[PDB]
Amino acid sequence: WIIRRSVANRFLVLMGALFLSIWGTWTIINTPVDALPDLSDVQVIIKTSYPGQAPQIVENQVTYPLTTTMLSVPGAKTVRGFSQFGDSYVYVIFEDGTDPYWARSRVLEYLNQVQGKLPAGVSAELGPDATGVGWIYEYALVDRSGKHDLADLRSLQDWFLKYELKTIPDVAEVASVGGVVKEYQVVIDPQRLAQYGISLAEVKSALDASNQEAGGSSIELAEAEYMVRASGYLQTLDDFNHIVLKASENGVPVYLRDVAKVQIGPEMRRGIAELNGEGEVAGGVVILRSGKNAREVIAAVKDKLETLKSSLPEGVEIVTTYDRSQLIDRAIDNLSGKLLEEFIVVAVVCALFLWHVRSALVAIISLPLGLCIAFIVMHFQGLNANIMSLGGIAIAVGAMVDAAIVMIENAHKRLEEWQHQHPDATLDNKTRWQVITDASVEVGPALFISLLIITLSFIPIFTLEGQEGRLFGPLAFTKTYAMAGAALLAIVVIPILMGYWLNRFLIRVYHPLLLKVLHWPKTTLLVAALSVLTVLWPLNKVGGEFLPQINEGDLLYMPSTLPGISAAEAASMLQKTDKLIMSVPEVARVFGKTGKAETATDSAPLEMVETTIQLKPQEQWRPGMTMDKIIEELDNTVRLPGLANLWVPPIRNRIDMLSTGIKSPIGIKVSGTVLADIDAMAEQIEEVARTVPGVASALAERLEGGRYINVEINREKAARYGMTVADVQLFVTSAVGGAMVGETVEGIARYPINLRYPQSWRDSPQALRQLPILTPMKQQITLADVADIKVSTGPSMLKTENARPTSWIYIDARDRDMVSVVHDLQKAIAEKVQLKPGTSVAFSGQFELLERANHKLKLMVPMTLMIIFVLLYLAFRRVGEALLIISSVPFALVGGIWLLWWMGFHLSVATGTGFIALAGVAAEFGVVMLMYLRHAIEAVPSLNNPQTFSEQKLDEALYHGAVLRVRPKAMTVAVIIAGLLPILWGTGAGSEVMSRIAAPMIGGMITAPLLSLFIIPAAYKLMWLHRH
Amino acid sequence: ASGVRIDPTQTQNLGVKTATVTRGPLTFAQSFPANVSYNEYQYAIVQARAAGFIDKVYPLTVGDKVQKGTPLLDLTIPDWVEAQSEYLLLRETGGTATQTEGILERLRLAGMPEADIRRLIATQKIQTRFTLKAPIDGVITAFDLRAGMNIAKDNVVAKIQGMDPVWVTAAIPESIAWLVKDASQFTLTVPARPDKTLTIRKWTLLPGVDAATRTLQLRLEVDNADEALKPGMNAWLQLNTASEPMLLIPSQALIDTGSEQRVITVDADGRFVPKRVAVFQASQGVTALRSGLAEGEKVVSSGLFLIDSEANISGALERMRS
Amino acid sequence: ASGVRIDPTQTQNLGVKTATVTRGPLTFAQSFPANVSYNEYQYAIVQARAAGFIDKVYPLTVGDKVQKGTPLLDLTIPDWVEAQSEYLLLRETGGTATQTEGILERLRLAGMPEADIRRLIATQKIQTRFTLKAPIDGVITAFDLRAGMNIAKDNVVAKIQGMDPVWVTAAIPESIAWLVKDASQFTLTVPARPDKTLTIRKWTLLPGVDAATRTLQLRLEVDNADEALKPGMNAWLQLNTASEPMLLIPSQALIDTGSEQRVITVDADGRFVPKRVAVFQASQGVTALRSGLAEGEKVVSSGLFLIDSEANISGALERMRS
Ligand SMILES: [Cu+2]
Ligand SMILES: [Cu+2]
């Protein structure tokens, strides 16, 4: 069809080809390299720091009405709710097709409204333009020189590093983690307050105004501007010691020095950060924005650090703690190796059947330029892609051959038939030009359209939503590039190259076999149906999983414990477990951090601690230790009472936490309208989630286990001393507590200045009972005189998904399959856990992503047929044959399963795409079948036969169709299979998922050819016996 | 089987320090502010026992310190002239020895200082120049009589009050009084001079709870034989007060959840078992219990939380309650 | 089942400032708030020696400075009319030396000044119109009497406070007492006159500490010839001195909760270990200690190891042992 012209134009294709070469060799050099598909959904965050009162009211007014005001504005997948004591985090997460920034702008309008509602000095701070996946490069500042300390390092990181980094384009925000905030503390001795007769509020009201600079207008002298200033900012210690409180006519003043000592101490720490199970240090963490390039920014950071590896003060040392580069480059240096092993293997397969070296080159050339014609459009794509693109061309390059070889094989034979008559003396130009072009026009539209079929029958995958969408989508458009690109290139290449320049025992075993399949052919077709029931058995008991647990150069550690643990303790158990991890001789570093870091991204309760664990090079571990094997020497080593242990890959961890929460591989939700009810019906789900041998550890989080020390203030008792509630509360906020009052603006930097009694008067409830207070009328009573204070238990961290209470349960299980562990749970969860009136048991996490994935695959197989079924009426015209191909396909898939079972895999989504692939190639190999069967017959021998019935002529044309296939078949089933084998094995950086997809292909692509060698051929006859 | 066990090599990695049960008194501790008021038992106020006027006023004024028998004023009292003029008249002219005492006593009753009157018997001549000594050893106040003046019967020459066994009253909030039992014991501190160790002579709880400031009054007489504790100076008193003997475990080991209050008993073998207890009071660092644990039992005080977490999850915390 | 053990006690090996304790002095540098007033040892209150009526009042008034012998007011004292007559008569008709010496001395006792007596003996004319003179030169601070008015024995005719050796009192804060006890030299300086900056070497420290501000007082007998430094000027008394050389460490290295205070020390190797210690007094960022450490030992320079938000000082410290 439109192939005759491809041959006509020669110099253009040649020139174009070099153009593709220079461009291709400059696109593999002009492209962004990423590590993995960013499943990051467009997430909008809103950090609010309602003073430091209590969770409840934080959920009732600064949160709830905020979550719902945003649900209005569309786009949101789910509205999340974090109500942490002191900090209110609210999420609206957009999904699928939503402009990331449109989301922000459309959200922003509501923001200014809430800002006015917040107390003075607090803002809702819009979230980092990035996400948790911004988790890129982390580092800790250590100084084993003593020249400096944490307080010095924190101020060293927040006023230097955090700034020398934020300017690096595409970096979003740099967060500081773990450290001590220089805080000017003032310890008021309640006694001296009573002695000098000064009210607490008098101190603050005095302090408040004792720090500030005041300017003055430009006074004119010597005809030049003179700008008057006014000393004010606090700088020296005495400046604190000399706060004016009162003074008599005498001139004798009363400063602050004589009311309290002003010591510089640590500020209430958000979250702790530790290093190598020995000591704690200052930490920094860069956060790549949106879906920008992970590598580019990282590398851009290194040399910038080397610029500072001299500007840093003696003693300090930036020890990296986590770097994606050590993975991305480990995943690319593996994929490059596979693409190479492919090429050479395809180059040794073509040389096995095909004899000439010149003729083997056509299979070669079709690959490099095939890449050049791939990278070209890869750089044009709009969504970016990632590593997946590399694995895609690994499957695309295989297809290249099938389109290269069949056509080239059609050339070796069209020349032989022209030699049986012509002498072998004169190879004139005219004779060496018709034979070549003739082979291209035959296979032309015959196979060209075929690829358009295989690509389209693989299209639906593109329709996958959100995460998995832009995940397998890449590997989907890549196949098209090379493959579909060859339908225009490889077709015009082979002829050009062919025109510019143990093989006996191979065709033996096969032919004698056909004698039996053509004998009583109906039953041979029936035995094929026998195979299906033998494949159903292997199916079950292999469960499955959303995706292979891709192991990386490190791993994140997640220990969850009961409600509210003291920061002191929750920073000791941390620094403890770290010492434990270092026990194993394969771990390099251990950057343990509990609680949030200085970023609107990480919202971690002190309860748990996400520790980054870099392990030594695989070329250094113990003789017999693997990822899954080491994890055991961890989960059974790092063990503390009441600490339920869980281990997960860091990257996969972050994303799940952002997208749906959880991020303990297994997740169980429970909606609640009654606080006590929800946790109750959720608690028992934990004691039965352990009764399964497949589960390793589990931890159910309580919604209200926080312990309170209430101060129920008494209005009547208060007036007795002439105090309004406000007056007495002052002694709760910055007398027993210690909220800020101001900041010492030190040039570039600023530090807090808190105010309270010494710790003694706030040891225990009793201390708060004897808490000495100085009335406005100079009376000196105790806090007990204006209020009774009792300890109670209530909400610790209010969680509201959909603005409606809902809790999740974390579950660890990496010694089984992610289907039998989630199934058995669903089985038991409703066997001895009777439901309260209000609850919504929703299995979330990695299984909620499983549901969606399997719905797309089940909605992909029927509509696979329509594209497949219609394209059979286009190229073949026959109606019966279409029912032969659509029924041909089930057998190809039949085999694909058996390989997964043997090798040892599970039913994943990566495998399913491969399974769709098997049909597409098996649907093409079944087409090159119907072709030779519809060509040979009508070519010369048959035509005299169909007028009636016969058995000999039919016997011959079938013996010919067997021969015309062996060579193309062998080549095809050779290159592809020989190319699938490298990835098959499964070992390698990140290869764990790239093999899961390919493995299914092999098995199904070995049973397909053999079943298309006998079945498809000996099945056409029956339909012929219908057109009579 | 109540309680629950833990792999020792885990409680060995946690630290898990243990403290044993004791029975005895809980030692209440608290501090209070205090002024160094002058010792009011050494209150002296000089007044002329008769009228007259001033000749000389020595170099003194409110603020200075004066010792026993310091020269204050030099006044001339004219009321006692006739007394003497009539006395010597009889002394030089024989005069009955019975009559002599009569007029000489008529002076005492008039007011003349029994010493200035002795100056008379020693030299038989009228007395007109009187020097006012400082009755005791202390500090001056309200010295409101100066030179060129006429002194009267009520004109307070000098109000000299002492500062030895110096007083120090300490304030105590009304709703705390009970922290002061006779069986108590105090030790004061003074920031002015932290180099000197103060010794208390006698303390007494004044029966008058000051009205102005709703506080109790606690006076303290303390040795100041070197004049180191200036009257008016600040002083921090810290008291210790025994308590009716209860059972005591470190407060670092009692877990209160409002509803109930529990600790974690340890067994012979080591089966960590929660045990409900009734608290009585706490302070200084330890807490008492009106009942609950048997004296001798072992209690966990370190890393207790994670232990209770395991114990709660182990449901051992549920079986106990039943 | 895992026998692998680990050390619970928290460790630090990257971020530790080790400071060494030193036997040294406390460096103080403080200027004090002071001000001037009349030399109270030059205090004169002139009032009438007896009742009467005022004829004329001299051009004086409060604020004006008089010089001694200055005419204050002319008054009529009728009290001694009859008394002087007895004398005048005794002279007109004999009168013995004893008779006169009598009447004339009973007259001194009556009140009449020996001066007004002499001006009587001479003139022989009875004395009715007397004149008051300022006893000492100084500033008049009172004047209860003006013309056309009568006078009594308590009415203050004039208060006149000198200032030749002008006084000046400073206010040192209670806390410093232990140092100022024995002081060498204070460098006084008043704003009014910057040229008259006297190096003060002698002074006295009053026993009272103005409770209103908790500062002890001390005066300075400074000269004032040019009477240029007037009473009522905010003056400044600077100071700078060492102390009794006592072992000291950086204040920042002192974990001071209410009551018990402590510091943490590094042993011969590197392990931590706290020690209860008594504090003397801080100065310019460094604290002096009474006992608890021997000079030479190594204390950790920062109490920045205990997380804020009321992380138990008592608790967190006990974790650093056993
Ligand atoms: Cu992060
Ligand atoms: Cu987490």
Curated annotation (Swiss-Prot), chain A:
Gene3D superfamilies: Multidrug efflux transporter AcrB pore domain, Multidrug efflux transporter AcrB pore domain like, Multidrug efflux transporter AcrB TolC docking domain, DN and DC subdomains, Multidrug efflux transporter AcrB transmembrane domain. GO terms for biological process: copper ion export; copper ion transmembrane transport; detoxification of copper ion; intracellular copper ion homeostasis; plasma membrane copper ion transport; response to copper ion; response to silver ion; response to toxic substance. GO terms for cellular component: membrane; plasma membrane. It comes from Escherichia coli (strain K12). GO terms for molecular function: copper ion binding; copper ion transmembrane transporter activity; silver ion transmembrane transporter activity; xenobiotic transmembrane transporter activity. The cus system plays an important role in copper tolerance under anaerobic growth and, under extreme copper stress, in aerobic growth. Part of a cation efflux system that mediates resistance to copper and silver. Changing M657I: Loss of copper resistance. Keywords: Cell inner membrane, Cell membrane, Copper, Copper transport, Ion transport, Membrane, Transmembrane, Transmembrane helix, Transport. This is Cation efflux system protein CusA. The gene is cusA. The chain crosses the membrane at residues 11-31, 335-355, 360-380, 388-408, 443-463, 482-501, 517-537, 856-876, 883-903, 913-933, 970-990, 997-1017. Induction: Transcriptionally regulated by CusR in response to copper and silver ions. Changing M818I: Slight decrease in copper resistance. It is a multi-pass membrane protein.
Curated annotation (Swiss-Prot), chains B, C:
One of its GO terms (molecular function) is copper ion binding. Induction: Transcriptionally regulated by CusR in response to copper and silver ions. It comes from the Bacteria. GO terms for cellular component: cell envelope; membrane; outer membrane-bounded periplasmic space. Keywords: Copper, Copper transport, Ion transport, Signal, Transport. GO terms for biological process: copper ion export; copper ion transmembrane transport; detoxification of copper ion; intracellular copper ion homeostasis; plasma membrane copper ion transport; response to copper ion; response to silver ion; response to toxic substance. Part of a cation efflux system that mediates resistance to copper and silver. The cus efflux system is composed of CusA, CusB, CusC and CusF. Belongs to the membrane fusion protein (MFP) (TC 8.A.1) family. The cus system plays an important role in copper tolerance under anaerobic growth and, under extreme copper stress, in aerobic growth. This is Cation efflux system protein CusB.
